[PDB]
Amino acid sequence: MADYLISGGTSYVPDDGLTAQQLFNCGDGLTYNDFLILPGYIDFTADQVDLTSALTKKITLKTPLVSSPMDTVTEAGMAIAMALTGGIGFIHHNCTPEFQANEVRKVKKYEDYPLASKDAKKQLLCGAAIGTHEDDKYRLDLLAQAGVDVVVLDSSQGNSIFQINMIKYIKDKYPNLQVIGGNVVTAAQAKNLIDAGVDALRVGMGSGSICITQEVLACGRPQATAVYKVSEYARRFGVPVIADGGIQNVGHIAKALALGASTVMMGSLLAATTEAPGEYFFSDGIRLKKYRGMGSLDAMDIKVAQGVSGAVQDKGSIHKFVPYLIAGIQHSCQDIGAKSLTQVRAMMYSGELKFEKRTSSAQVEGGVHSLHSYEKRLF
Amino acid sequence: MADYLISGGTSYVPDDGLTAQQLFNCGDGLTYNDFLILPGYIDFTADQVDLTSALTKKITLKTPLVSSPMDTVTEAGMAIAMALTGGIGFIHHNCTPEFQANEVRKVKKYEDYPLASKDAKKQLLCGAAIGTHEDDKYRLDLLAQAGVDVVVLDSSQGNSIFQINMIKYIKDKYPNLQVIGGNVVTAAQAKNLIDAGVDALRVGMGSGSICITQEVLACGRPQATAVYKVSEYARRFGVPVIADGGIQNVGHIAKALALGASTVMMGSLLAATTEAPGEYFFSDGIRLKKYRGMGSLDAMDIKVAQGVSGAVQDKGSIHKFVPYLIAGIQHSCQDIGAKSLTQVRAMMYSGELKFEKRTSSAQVEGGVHSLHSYEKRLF
Amino acid sequence: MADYLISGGTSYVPDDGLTAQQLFNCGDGLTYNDFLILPGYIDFTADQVDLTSALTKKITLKTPLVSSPMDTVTEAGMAIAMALTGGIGFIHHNCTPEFQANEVRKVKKYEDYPLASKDAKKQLLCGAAIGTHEDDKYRLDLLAQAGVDVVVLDSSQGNSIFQINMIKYIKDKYPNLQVIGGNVVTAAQAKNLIDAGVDALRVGMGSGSICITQEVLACGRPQATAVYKVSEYARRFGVPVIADGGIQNVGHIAKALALGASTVMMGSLLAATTEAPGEYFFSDGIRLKKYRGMGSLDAMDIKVAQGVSGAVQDKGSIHKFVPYLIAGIQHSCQDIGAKSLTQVRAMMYSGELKFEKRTSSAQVEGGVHSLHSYEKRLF
Amino acid sequence: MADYLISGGTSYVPDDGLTAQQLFNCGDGLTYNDFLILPGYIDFTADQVDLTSALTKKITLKTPLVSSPMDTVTEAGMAIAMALTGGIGFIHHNCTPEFQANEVRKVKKYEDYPLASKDAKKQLLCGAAIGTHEDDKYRLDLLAQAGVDVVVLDSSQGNSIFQINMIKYIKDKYPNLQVIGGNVVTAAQAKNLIDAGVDALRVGMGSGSICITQEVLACGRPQATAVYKVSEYARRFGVPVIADGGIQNVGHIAKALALGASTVMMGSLLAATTEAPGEYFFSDGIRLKKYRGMGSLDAMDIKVAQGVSGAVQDKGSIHKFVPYLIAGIQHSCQDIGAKSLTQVRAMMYSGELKFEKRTSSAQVEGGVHSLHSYEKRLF
């Protein structure tokens, strides 16, 4: 009958809101806080949401969470905790190659965690970072001998001849080793690195909490727009994206995933956790832990500093914080009417998922307001 | 793996062309010849295309073809042929009520045609037209006694209190009789008639081959835009649309169906057929049959004429012409990558189906050109 | 000094006109006659212009001219003449496989023409057309045994599972045989065929002089826009384009090449030439030769005709007509300030080359006007 | 082959971001902090970047850095240091003509610095400022007798008959003396001054750190837009531009140079340096030096004040600060993929260089955020 024959029985949907393509075609240079995702239809419970994510072409994780390769964020303990909770961690390289290899070995030889990320031998997955310099090759070798599963080329500007040469060298010498390229914020850089043969991209420049690259070199891009554009280009070749930098809350993670990113990497949000490197200290009755950019003078100690050093308040253990992030992501997916992150991205690329801009007054309204005092308890 | 997890395994589609919503949002006042449908992907043969169409809320036809209720187009013979070939015909009402009832009876009592349109009693479906005047009520009664399955309220401007009153009267006295309202070209008229309780809409004003309403009363609308807008509004309430007027070739039928119409009604294209009323004559060696608008002075014989009278060249029998139209529609559906008209409309409403405008030079290029002489043989 | 340091010594260029990207982003559905190329700077003579063109990934021609695979256009003689003059011809397949193979053999065994197109063995290059049906495979084999250098899959709508399967079969059985896919007018079809592994694309649908596909199936695209879009997509993967259909004069060839096409294929312009198949006849004192679409009822003799049959006036020998086209293309390149077609396309993609739209009055002004009578002698 | 013939072998570049022309055609009134430069491709080291810049038509500097002619910024010592480090300084004129001439003489008679800016006699380059009043002529004479190499006409609004008359007088009496006109923010003012015969333009009004002209007289322009527009007009006649005012960090210098400026002049950034005039003092444990606008009541002591007076924190010696600025500019050039500032401007005018807007949230993200405390050490 006509009820089905007119358009296939699918009840029409009133057109309200903007698609991601429309939102990011205005050239406004948007970030996470500049927009919201409109709600959809709910016919499932939050606990049924699947957060399985692809870190690289061949590596798949049960959660989209990744720890940044920073000397104040990720060491063997942080990597072990992230792998157990369903994510992965990248060991920093501001150390001797032997120390990094030893940390990787500690991660690999570690012995309920149903979501634990493991390799074919039931060993916890581990990542590591290397540079684009000649010495890094030796470092890579040691990391290869320690059983590292994936390596990320660490650089503020990854579209360089040095990085392409290193990618080709790695692929020739270690064909089975997954390689992540970055950082990039434009489609041209992504094209160059994908042609080089990378298995994933790391997207972000200037958005880091401890980053001052934008005001020093005038180079960067708003995080949300960069994520959207790079993910849209990379999806044409089946290359996943890691949104790196600018993450402050679960909402940012959900927005990054909805815009095309397959994984999200956080430095500050995981900083000051128990598993993070360093020891807690006290200042004015507040418990804090050090957190610094790898380009800050302290980290590298004419030198042009690209980062700052400071402190972050204690957040507890990873084993309690990560489940909260997982629950928040699941609830966001339920609110937008998606049973999986893959479905979220499919809806966004198909135009089903709708977005809306936020004015400054809209941002004020969205946050806490009109209260004499209040306390915020996330969980 | 990433090949499926990024967006669900559906290979991305480059964005090329305009959606129907984009095409008809420019306010250019487009007709059929002003645009083309872009080709898609073929993974089936043309003969598998299903042309099942909904004439009304409860009446379904195996073909989308309908014959206009005109004194030079549709009588008992034309209706019988159209029903046998898979369509339906509406008996004109420029005659006594008894004559129209007798024609309806002839259609109903008629005794391989696999696509034949039949009612629950295996009797050929038949339609009829009535006016919005007091006398028409009596006419309707006779048509009801003859077994008519559907009635169309014939008027150049159907958004009138008289038509709404007649619709309510029919629904009260004949609850099981399907009623078609029209003609309308705007969403407001469609809203009024749908609220009245019509089972289908007849869309078109000024586009008829024998119509001069636009130049006499300055009232009308381009056919393609009217079809799109009225169909888009009516789909919200499950009300099918009959695109009436302006059809000159199979391409026009395909375009009308793709823009939202569930059926297409033709007066001139079926004129001069063997089953059409009247007798053939000869002029300058050309075999012709009369064809006139119901608003022309001849048809109604101060009077304001809204149509003209003339002649149309012979086209043969319906039993050979209609199969050609069916084959052409199937081939168009295959070219645009749809296995059914329902799928065509679903794709158009979902944005998958793409369109492109045509400049005057584009129209010239599309037609036959750069030939000293030629002969056109459709089939 | 400042004369060079400000911007590198390159004198600034006033911004006047539109780039191709700007021109074809308006969604107006433009054809060749709807726009003009603005002149540039001349610092060379016309005879220095290089017309070297890439027919496929591995086949390069000294001229961009190709003869269509039509039963009234290209046979052994036409192919031989085109190869000698610097182009190439594709043997039609509306014949027995043995006849086509014999024509290919005649072309291959033919024994000053400095621009002659030859293979590694100094044998004239020859192309042939095949269908996407099961029988065509056998045909292909014979064409392979006759020494054909390139094969084009002939279809009005080339984005089909059948064509992809045939492409894969050819690449598996004949890895060294160049394959041309088509016809396509959108970037999605081009993506599918390029992923299948074609070596070149054939772009055009509805623009043929003897084509009525647009009015019968409502499917097609304006030629210029299709050429631009498909060429822009294909250039990303190094796949050349053959603009097919709608060519009436040298200006159209130049426009097609400037919009991204690597070669141009003409059916009507080369029709009625001495080397074309068939015999001349006389009508009202005019010497004409037959020319028909391969989809016309005559060519294939329910059948849905997609072409017409007619006659075209005599044009002389190919050996005199082709040099005129070469000279005209060279003069157009000189006028737009390019020493080669490669440079033309580089300028167009870089935005240096500028275009302007043409109104109908502009088209009238561009043509001959305000004369009581005149005679047009091209050369 | 096709790899090179299609477009010349240059791999296509995905279109991402806006050109400067597109960015500044929106009429949004942008400043430095409102946009970012997108990264490019790196195939060289930062130390190979050439910062050679044209101060005027005939004067070329090895660095684009200039010191403002202010009584709290530039005296003989500051000029000597700037010339030694590769820039130049302009002696202020809020003093007796004899004092200014003596300072110029001190600069000229000063006796490793490979980048030192020297004249044909191996004497350090020196600039000076004069007004548009009758007395200034005498001042000019003394400055001419002291060996000044370039003179800048100091005025908040340089498009005046007085300034044009002074320019003509200088050119008539001192044909070989380079003259800088300003200040201007629009293309009409630039046209007038260029027609007068200036050798360079000084661009800025309302952007100074100590300037309140915008709120007092309602006259001014955002700095970035003014720089872009004036530079674009001046480049047509080979006239360089000095971006004056609004510089707070290296990123601002890089942005100003990328938008068309040939040199950058800073008052506040060089204020409180050791070579700056005045003596350090202490306030609340902070070491500060005075810095005031030349239009402030203190500087000129009804009077309409156009500037304010205050203090700036100590920054150290010029010989250490300037190298940091040079290194930062080089790193920015490397990040955007340019080996020289000339190449940067050529890329920007050709559209190769891309830009992106910044929302307020984008600005917040770009800066330091999400830290309990931190310390910023530039170098």
Ligand SMILES: Nc1ncnc2c1ncn2[C@@H]1O[C@H](COP(=O)(O)OP(=O)(O)OC[C@H]2O[C@@H]([n+]3cccc(NC(=O)c4cccs4)c3)[C@H](O)[C@@H]2O)[C@@H](O)[C@H]1O
């Ligand atoms: N084969 C090569 N031959 C010759 N020349 C080469 C070669 N390869 C690169 N160059 C050039 O030398 C410069 C150096 O810069 P890179 O080594 O590329 O690191 P970087 O730019 O990210 O940070 C800046 C400083 O931070 C310190 N640090 C330590 C550990 C980790 C990080 N990670 C990050 O900060 C970020 C990651 C993601 C977003 S930020 C930073 C270190 O001291 C750096 O110098 C460039 O010009 C380059 O082209």
Ligand SMILES: Nc1ncnc2c1ncn2[C@@H]1O[C@H](COP(=O)(O)OP(=O)(O)OC[C@H]2O[C@@H]([n+]3cccc(NC(=O)c4cccs4)c3)[C@H](O)[C@@H]2O)[C@@H](O)[C@H]1O
């Ligand atoms: N209860 C009512 N009480 C009082 N006043 C009423 C009432 N009801 C309507 N009026 C008003 O009287 C006028 C008459 O006009 P209608 O009867 O509505 O027919 P119409 O406007 O289509 O054509 C015009 C003339 O053609 C002749 N004719 C004969 C047979 C069929 C057609 N079909 C068509 O032509 C078309 C169909 C689709 C596109 S064209 C035409 C006839 O002689 C007409 O007068 C209007 O003002 C109206 O409001």
Ligand SMILES: Nc1ncnc2c1ncn2[C@@H]1O[C@H](COP(=O)(O)OP(=O)(O)OC[C@H]2O[C@@H]([n+]3cccc(NC(=O)c4cccs4)c3)[C@H](O)[C@@H]2O)[C@@H](O)[C@H]1O
């Ligand atoms: N393996 C397969 N198994 C099953 N079903 C298949 C398979 N493969 C395709 N089908 C389907 O059967 C139909 C047939 O159509 P095709 O063979 O694709 O040719 P076509 O559509 O271009 O022209 C139309 C008619 O012209 C005649 N003719 C003869 C020689 C050359 C041409 N060249 C052209 O005209 C043009 C070239 C460029 C622009 S026009 C035409 C012939 O009689 C045709 O039937 C389609 O539905 C298709 O999907």
Ligand SMILES: Nc1ncnc2c1ncn2[C@@H]1O[C@H](COP(=O)(O)OP(=O)(O)OC[C@H]2O[C@@H]([n+]3cccc(NC(=O)c4cccs4)c3)[C@H](O)[C@@H]2O)[C@@H](O)[C@H]1O
């Ligand atoms: N031949 C002439 N005959 C007759 N009338 C003339 C003639 N020439 C100009 N007038 C008119 O008299 C007024 C005076 O104004 P100017 O002398 O043009 O200086 P100014 O407007 O920049 O600053 C304002 C006050 O600051 C004090 N001061 C001292 C030293 C340096 C500066 N430099 C700056 O501040 C800036 C530079 C770049 C951006 S700001 C300022 C001084 O006391 C000023 O009066 C105008 O109306 C004018 O048309």
Ligand SMILES: O=c1[nH]cnc2c1ncn2[C@@H]1O[C@H](COP(=O)(O)O)[C@@H](O)[C@H]1O
């Ligand atoms: O020193 C630095 N300068 C600039 N960016 C940095 C530096 N150190 C780390 N980053 C980047 O900023 C990210 C930290 O993001 P966040 O802490 O979540 O805001 C890291 O994962 C790196 O991509």
Ligand SMILES: O=c1[nH]cnc2c1ncn2[C@@H]1O[C@H](COP(=O)(O)O)[C@@H](O)[C@H]1O
């Ligand atoms: O006399 C008339 N004046 C105006 N419209 C008419 C008249 N007669 C019929 N029509 C309409 O025009 C249609 C004919 O369309 P066509 O003959 O396919 O061009 C009919 O089905 C009516 O909707």
Ligand SMILES: O=c1[nH]cnc2c1ncn2[C@@H]1O[C@H](COP(=O)(O)O)[C@@H](O)[C@H]1O
């Ligand atoms: O019968 C047909 N129907 C539709 N298109 C055709 C037919 N025959 C040839 N063509 C196409 O039209 C082209 C002829 O272009 P033209 O003769 O230069 O205008 C051929 O090369 C085919 O691509």
Ligand SMILES: O=c1[nH]cnc2c1ncn2[C@@H]1O[C@H](COP(=O)(O)O)[C@@H](O)[C@H]1O
């Ligand atoms: O008193 C003033 N009122 C307005 N502008 C001034 C005044 N003094 C200096 N300026 C301008 O402001 C610039 C200082 O820029 P900044 O200190 O880098 O922010 C100088 O080079 C002059 O162009």
Ligand SMILES: [K+]
């Ligand atoms: K709120």
Ligand SMILES: [K+]
């Ligand atoms: K045509």
Ligand SMILES: [K+]
């Ligand atoms: K003309």
Ligand SMILES: [K+]
């Ligand atoms: K930041």
